[PDB]
Amino acid sequence: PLCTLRQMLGEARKHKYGVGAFNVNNMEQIQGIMKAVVQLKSPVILQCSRGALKYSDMIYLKKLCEAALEKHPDIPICIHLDHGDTLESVKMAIDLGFSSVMIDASHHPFDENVRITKEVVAYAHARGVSVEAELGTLGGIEQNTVQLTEPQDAKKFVELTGVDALAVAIGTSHGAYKFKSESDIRLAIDRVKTISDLTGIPLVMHGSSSVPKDVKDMINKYGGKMPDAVGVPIESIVHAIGEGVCKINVDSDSRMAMTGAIRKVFVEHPEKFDPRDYLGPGRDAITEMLIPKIKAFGSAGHAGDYKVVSLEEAKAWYK
Template identity: 50%
Template sequence: MAVSFKDLGLCNTRDMFAGAMAGKYAIPAYNFNNMEQLQAIISGCAQSRSPVILQVSKGARNYANGTLLRYMAMGAVELAHQTAPIPIALHLDHGDSFELCKDCVDSGFSSVMIDGSHLSFQENMALTKKVVEYAHQFDVSVEGELGVLAGIEDEVSSEVSHYTDPEEVEEFVRFTGVDSLAISIGTSHGAFKFAPGKPVPPLRFDILEEIERRLPGFPIVLHGASSVVPEYVDMINAYGGDIKGALGVPEEQLRRAASSAVCKINIDSDGRLAFTAAIRKALAENPAEFDPRKYLSPARDLLVELIKHKNREVLGSAERI
């Protein structure tokens, strides 16, 4: 039997994006895979009084179990309300089929992404429209994608990027009825976004500005927007890791994007790096430790601090509730 996201205390993204557009900030969309990551995301956003989109990839959903995720989302709402009643959406990240999106809608997700960017333009439009028609029956928001990001993250991978063609966006949005659109302007999935030893190329704000002109007031999404914080990379390497040449998107470029039509910015790799760095440090300093609570707690704490920093200094979403 289908479950409504409203019964879980969740929100769709429509009002979130309207507020972000008016206030010139972006809603944080943080990926999570386990309880400690979820606790950190909710605590960090509640403490900074920021709305939040909890993101679950196809791989994370398989890992955590769809039924368990539903109850984790309910618990997240209750946890947040202990500090601040922040709006929370549960979003499928990079859904790759109608069947997966439908299952998430039926399971209580309040927002889904259908990623048809690997298909032809016409096939992408047809698949996206099919998802929209189903999801909108239940007031669930839908994110589509035009353009391809390079890099690897979870089950999403591409060796090269293809910038979004601004000439396609109007037809795509009009035909499909999507609520938001993910575009490619130079961000990339994973921790290795750019070639080491070379200047980081700026994001293609000219493409973003042309899309804004063609779709005035329409919510735009950036994927692959982790900054790959050097502090965490250095900590991982200092405690036995081997991450060389990892580079991310400069935070000042993300802040500029967040003050435009970009209403949602996805952050996954930064959270993974912070979590891993704290665990490596804890185990290196306490090699006899085998209680997971003792090394997962500092990881959770470091992730809370990262999230509060992102909300306050990068996305501008803090103190919006």
């Protein structure tokens, strides 16, 4: 059923596992993700960016998420707004029925980040909706302007805002080119345990796609041009999860799985022109790439662990 981020991540924090949050843009992507989480009896966070809502004219994505929720009533499903930039984008997401929102004011100075975030927290918690915010900016470590999260400031930021989850900056970045090479992977995950203990809340890792070999090789084997793609190694994510990371954002891996599958069909069977002929394999490649990932995050088998608290009932938490 529709689940808040606060409960879903609280349960992950308590039992030391992580929950993958997968960005969705259309029907086959949601189907591919759901087949994987349903098979593994895992909770899931379906997230939609402002760009996804635009691409889907908002209503189509809302209806698709409803379909997922209706079809698998036994799976805790959080519908989350990714990278919300204003209170207005948050009001919009809540009106579409979302149970969680991220207000990203990380490129503003600390006090303005706190101000913007507090406004969203007052509005969202009044409706039982969860809030994730960010302190520190994404980007690779290696004139540098990336601002990694300072644990003592994360402590103050959470105390001033009351957010349910905090996205941290530890050297990851969005996209398929996270590090110059596979031998040049530098992350700042040693601070995760410190942030977790000082803040006392679930932490979120962004730009955490792994760019698995199978998927990258298929794309490059069939006309694709992504020779230098590199993502975050799964062992690193597992380590961070053990330290307090409860939500892991993944988008690029599912995009690549679908693209690689389509490129293979186009080459092997050039006479086929039915979109189902290649979007089907695409959906399935997403499911297959996700199964071992979800097992490593550890959320497998946990979908049944708890009675899901509704948004109306969740309003009590903030009173």
